[PDB]
Amino acid sequence: PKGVSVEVAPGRVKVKGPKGELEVPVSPEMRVVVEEGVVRVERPSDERRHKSLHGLTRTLIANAVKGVSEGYSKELLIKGIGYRARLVGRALELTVGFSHPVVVEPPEGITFEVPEPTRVRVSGIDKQKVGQVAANIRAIRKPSAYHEKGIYYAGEPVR
Amino acid sequence: KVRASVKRICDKCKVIRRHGRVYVICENPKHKQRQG
Amino acid sequence: MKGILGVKVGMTRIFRDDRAVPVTVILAGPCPVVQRRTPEKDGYTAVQLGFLPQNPKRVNRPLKGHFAKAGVEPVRILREIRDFNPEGDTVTVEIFKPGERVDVTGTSKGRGFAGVMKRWNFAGGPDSHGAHKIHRHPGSIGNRKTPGRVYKGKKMAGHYGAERVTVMNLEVVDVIPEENLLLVKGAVPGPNGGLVIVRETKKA
Amino acid sequence: WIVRINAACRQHGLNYSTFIHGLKKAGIEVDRKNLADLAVREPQVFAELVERAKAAQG
Amino acid sequence: MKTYVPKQVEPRWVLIDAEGKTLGRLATKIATLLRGKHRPDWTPNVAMGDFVVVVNADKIRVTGKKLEQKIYTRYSGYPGGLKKIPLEKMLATHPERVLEHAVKGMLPKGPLGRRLFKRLKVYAGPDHPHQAQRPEKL
RNA sequence: AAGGGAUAACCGCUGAAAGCAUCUAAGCGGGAAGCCCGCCCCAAGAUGAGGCCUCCCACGGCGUCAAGCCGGUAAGGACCC
RNA sequence: UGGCACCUCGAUGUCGGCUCGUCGCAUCCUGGGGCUGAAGAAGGUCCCAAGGGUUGGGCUGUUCGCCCAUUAAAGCGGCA
RNA sequence: AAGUCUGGGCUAAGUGGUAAAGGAUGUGGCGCCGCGAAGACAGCC
């Protein structure tokens, strides 16, 4: 890619980009050093263990790469009557039915968004962390209620 | 849910071996099984 | 960890707001710090106070004037207070304010060779109908061939009382700084004239 | 006898199993495990016997 | 007569540490040293093994999946007095213990067996806080 | 009991083998009146007999020369009350 | 409940109750959880889980049972 | 007491270290059948 600096260590790999750098732990089952205008990744004997590691490798790398050139993503459509969200700091005070409103801290790398009062999204350079913290929010009130209330993914309703 | 002969009760069911155990994942919640 | 040494004097009750509270009076007199335990040479952090001062100079080897405040090592000796490190110059009562919560160690009164059904509150056997030589006995103590022995710890008769006992979380009703006094919410172990130590509690 | 022979000849490279096989082929119906106290008195001469042994062995 | 027999010679000391090694596969040789089974004085009734200091305990390799899976046991003489503690928790606190337990088991069980277990000095290290010799074996 | 750590069924993230999908095969999170520690009590015969503060020190006379020596001491400790 | 007759007939006390407990989980309450023919409340059913709890009387020698009045529950077994 | 001996394979459950009907895309080695420039096996017209 463009402004990407694909560095290498013994058993790790450091990917520098215009948005920052990330750290992927990578098994001794390969020899990849700063190579060409892009990057190639190979593997030894076609046995079940190796096969499964190739492809896994291929993607963590690629995800870190697309992360460092902006990899944000993820959005929650909140439904229900009294149900709605309100930004306070970079933290989030959403209210969803309980006898008490709900406040939420963002750790390192991450910011929450409140475009609507009933829509929300999570920005992130990492990826693992993003999908994690996405679900963490959804948790506070999942859906079901022979239909209606609760806070959904981009995906949608059921019997 | 928990039985000795676990098999596939639909065309949506799926045999995954996780936790070192044998399970089954359908679309409808009623066909979700685990061998024990 | 706030902490004085002291002595049970006795108890009565006072009135408060509009009701009687039962209280037990401690004399936690001035406690001259005589030694500090460092983690650098002792390994742990603590302070050694002293209590009943009075001593007609029978002090020989532990004369240890070695720390300035050696003003006659106390009759009722000296105890450490674990993690407690004050302005090194005696500890009076002022540390505890009314409304504070305290734990209190002490030496329970001594019952001696006590029977089961005091030592342990057993049922014993019937004052009438059948037998007559087992009204106060323990009954059975085992099974038969297996395991063919008695469990370690079995509750049987023996020495009861005269033991270290800490009752937790008592209220400080009052404090007379004047007399080195301390008032707590009744029921503190051992007899009058007994050594006790008084600390902060662990509460909520 | 055997426990200390082993200790001693293991001190020259090989092991007991090997050493005895060697002597067998080497034609020295001798040692007599008893008389491998040579290992302690006169190790000069024990050393010699080990050479003969690994002679027939390698 | 043939009593090959020793006379008391000066006991040797030794330092070792296969910090990177499989225990058991370590502990075996240690013991063989603690008895004089390497030297041809060997005399079964007496104690002329090496004194042995092992630096840098913990660190040891353990094969397969032996964490949570290897469980250690102590019974007090009481009702339900069984304790079960897994390998993980032993390295976590008291790792000097791990290599100790393993050698004990490979030593004979008489009085002389306990005498030799005393000849074995174990420190999670490095730095063996006693210097007066140690012909390091690698 | 607060509280701290690790878990059970179970609920997830990311993820190939198997271009899809999968809680798993490399990794990462939630999760019990239960486990570990925390509260109270005993505890260095823990022959692995621990540590810190302070004290008392002289060979006085004899063997296979430091008691394996008897008889007075020291700091101290008993006896009787 | 039986089958067999191996130690015990120069003796291994035998039903029920009381006293004192301890252990199993195939769990009666209380703690987690998945389905539900789960609107809610209240259930059904299976999974994880003994840490602690598991009432008082009428009848009968009773064990057990039936009945009165309560309970979060009024658990099933082993230890001659 | 005596080989951490030599050479080629399998197994990741501590199986080994003692259990059946019946279940399972666990692995490794053989098969002989579909049909693949009427180039859809997996994915969005």
Answer whether C touches D (≥3 Cβ pairs < 8 Å). no
DSSP string, E52-121: EEE-S-S--B--TT-SSSSEEEEE-SSTT-EEEEEHHHHHHS-HHHHHHHHHHTTS-SSHHHHHHHHTEE
- Cβ–Cβ < 8 Å for C69, C32: yes
- Crossing angle of helices D43-55 and D16-25, in 10° steps, is 70
- Spatial distance from the CA of D54 to the C1' of H30 (Å): 48
- Residue D18: its H or E element: helix D16-25
DSSP per residue over C92-147, as a string? -GGG--TT-EEEEEEE--EEEEE-TTTSS------SSSS-SS-TT-------BTTB
Question: How many whole angstroms separate alpha carbon A20 and alpha carbon A64?
Answer: 10
Helix or strand holding residue C149 (H, E):
none
Helix (H, G, I), strand (E, B) or coil at D55: helix
Given CB atoms, is D38 within the 8 Å cutoff of chain E?
Answer: no
Cα separation of the two ends of chain A: 45
Answer for the pair D36, D5: CB distance below 8 angstroms, yes or no.
yes
Residues A62, A63, A67: CA angle, nearest 5 degrees? 120
Angle at C92 between CA C91 and CA C95, to 5 degrees: 85
Shortest CA gap E9–chain D (Å): 14
The DSSP bridge pattern shows strands E13-16 and E51-54 to be: parallel
Give dist(CA E70, CA E62) in Å, integer: 10
Contact status, residue D4 vs residue D39, Cβ threshold 8 Å: yes
Distance (Å) from the alpha carbon of C152 to chain E's nearest alpha carbon:
5
- Cα separation, C6 vs C182, in Å, equals 9
**Burial code of A78-117, b = ≥16 C-beta within 10 A, e = fewer?**
bbbeebbbebeeeebebebeeeeeeeeebeebbebbbeee
Q: Search chain D and give the residue with CA nearest E4.
A: D37
Query: Are C24 and C184 within 8 A, CB to CB?
Result: yes
Residue C177 DSSP class:
G
Non-local (6+) Cβ contacts of E58 within 8 A are E19, E91, E95, E98, E124
Q: Is B27 annotated as a binding residue?
A: no
**D10 in helix, strand or coil?**
helix
Place of tokens 């290290």: E125
Structure tokens at A66: 């697309």
Q: Are E23 and E59 in contact (CB under 8 A)?
A: no
Contacts of B14 by beta carbon, 8 Å cutoff, 6+ apart: B24, B25, B26
As a whole number of angstroms, the distance between CA C26 and CA C11 comes to 9
Q: Can you give the length of chain E in residues?
A: 138
Strand positions, DSSP E, chain C: 3-16, 19-27, 35-37, 46-48, 101-107, 110-114, 158-161, 164-174, 181-184, 195-200
Chains that touch E (3 or more CB pairs under 8 A): C, D
The 8-class DSSP code of residue E12 comes to: P
DSSP E10: P
Is C12 strand, coil or helix?
strand
- In which residue are the tokens 């020295």 written? D28
Closest to C33 (Cα-Cα) out of C76, C75, C1, C80: C80
Are E99 and E34 in contact, with CB atoms under 8 Å apart?
no
Q: Which residue bears the tokens 């679309």?
A: B27
How far CA E85 is from CA of E62, E97, E105, in Å, comes to: 17, 13, 18
Give nearest nucleotide to C203 (CA–C1').
Answer: F2
Nearest CB partner across the interface for D37, out of E2, E37, E38: E2
Separation CA E100–CA E34 (nearest Å): 13
C33/C95 Cα distance (integer angstroms): 15
Residues in chain D: 58
In 3D, which of A61, A4, A64, A2 has the Cα closest to residue A32?
A61
Q: How is residue D2 written in tokens? A: 């055997």
Tokens of C128: 């009438």
Q: Decide: helix, strand or coil at residue C63.
A: helix
Task: Give the residue from E122, E129, E119, E127 showing the smallest Cα distance to E57.
Answer: E122
Q: Is B9 annotated for ligand binding?
A: no
Element containing residue A55 per DSSP (H, E): helix A48-68
Question: How far in angstroms lies nucleotide G36's C1' from the CA of residue B3?
Answer: 18
Q: How far apart are the first and last CA of chain E?
A: 40
Residue C42 CB-half CA count within 13 A: 13
Spatial separation of the C-alpha atoms in residues C5 and C201, rounded to whole Å: 15
Residue type present at position E97:
R
Q: Contact, C122 vs C107, CB < 8 A? A: no
Tokens of E88: 């993980």
Q: Which two tokens stand for residue E122?
A: 């174990």
Measured CA to CA in angstroms, residue E125 lies from E18, E54, E122, E132 at distances of 12, 9, 9, 18
Q: Tell which phi-psi region holds residue E28, choosing left (phi > 0), alpha (psi between -120 and 50) or beta.
A: alpha
The residue type at A118: T
E77: chain C residues, CB-CB within 8 Å: 152
Cα–Cα dist A58/B12, whole Å: 30
A139 DSSP 8-state letter: H
At residue C21, what are phi and psi to the nearest 5 degrees?
-110, 135
Strand (E) or helix (H) holding E122: strand E120-122
Q: Tokens representing A45?
A: 């004997």
Q: How far is CA A144 from CA A3, A141, C140, C193, in A?
A: 45, 10, 60, 69
Residue E46, amino acid = V
Strand partners, B35: B3
Q: How far is C141 from chain E (nearest CA, A)?
A: 14
Cα A83–chain centre separation:
25
Cβ-based neighbour number of residue B6 at 10 Å: 17
Q: Looking at the complex, does the CB of residue C153 fall below 8 Å from at least one CB of chain E?
A: yes
* E42/D7 Cα distance (integer angstroms): 8
Tell me, in Å, how far CA of A145 is from C1' of F10? 21
Burial of C25 from C-beta contacts in 10 A (0-12 / 13-18 / 19+)? buried
Question: 3-class DSSP state for residue D47?
Answer: helix
> In the numeric block, which tokens belong to residue D26?
């080497």
Q: Is B7 marked as a binding-site residue?
A: no
Token pair, residue D16, equals 């007991």
Residue pair D6/E40 in contact by the 8 Å Cβ criterion: no
Spatial neighbors of C70 by CB under 8 A, at least 6 apart, are C34, C63, C64
Is B10 one of the annotated binding-site residues?
yes
Strand partners, A15: A6, A22
Structure tokens of D4? 């200390």
Does E have 3 or more CB contacts under 8 Å with C? yes
